[PDB]
Amino acid sequence: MIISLIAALAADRVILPADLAWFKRNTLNKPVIMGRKTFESIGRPLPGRLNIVISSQPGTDERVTWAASIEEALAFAGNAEEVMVMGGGRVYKQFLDRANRMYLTHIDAEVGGDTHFPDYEPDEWESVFSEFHDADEANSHSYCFEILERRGENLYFQ
Numbered sequence: 084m085i086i087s088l089i090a091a092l093a094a095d096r097v098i099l100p101a102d103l104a105w106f107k108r109n110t111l112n113k114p115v116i117m118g119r120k121t122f123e124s125i126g127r128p129l130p131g132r133l134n135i136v137i138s139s140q141p142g143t144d145e146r147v148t149w150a151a152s153i154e155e156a157l158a159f160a161g162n163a164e165e166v167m168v169m170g171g172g173r174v175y176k177q178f179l180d181r182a183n184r185m186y187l188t189h190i191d192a193e194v195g196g197d198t199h200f201p202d203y204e205p206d207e208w209e210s211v212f213s214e215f216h217d218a219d220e221a222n223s224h225s226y227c228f229e230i231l232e233r234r235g236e237n238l239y240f241q
């Protein structure tokens with residue numbers, strides 16, 4: 084199982100219909116993992132996806148799967164090839180070390196707020212996909228879709 088982070092980042096790692104569409108393309112038909120506040124932000128289960136919500140305060144919405152921990156979350160995702168972790172801030176940080184792939188939307192915007200996507204060391208990651216877009220009528224800012232994979236373990240010894 085590949086564990087993947089997916090997130091939209093403004094300038095300075097701070098956390099557009101095209102991003103949402105990108106989000107959907109990349110999560111549809113997969114298990115999606117999220118914290119409770121993110122689930123509340125969406126306002127609903129995501130159709131066509133196995134919704135796993137991690138929380139110590141499991142809600143009454145039986146349409147989604149409620150997990151108490153990362154381990155139980157990954158267990159519900161079973162033998163999936165790829166599990167999508169979609170926020171929020173704390174959850175990204177809690178999954179980072181296990182993640183081997185990241186889908187990142189780099190939004191060209193400078194916005195305040197003190198909630199950041201985790202510090203990751205760029206050297207430890209490589210880009211396998213990248214796609215820039217200009218701002219248009221529907222999308223207020225330029226933005227860049229990117230997929231990063233964790234560089235494999237260095238196996239060489241002198």
Ligand SMILES: CN(Cc1cnc2nc(N)nc(N)c2n1)c1ccc(C(=O)N[C@@H](CCC(=O)O)C(=O)O)cc1
Pocket residue numbers: 089090091102103104105106107121124125129130168169170187188
């Ligand atoms: C607030 N929230 C969290 C959210 C928003 N944008 C993101 N964008 C990216 N790149 N990554 C995320 N993790 C992400 N998360 C939301 C809110 C709405 C929907 C939503 O209604 N998505 C529909 C898309 C609706 C449509 O495009 O027609 C879907 O089917 O996935 C998703 C996430």
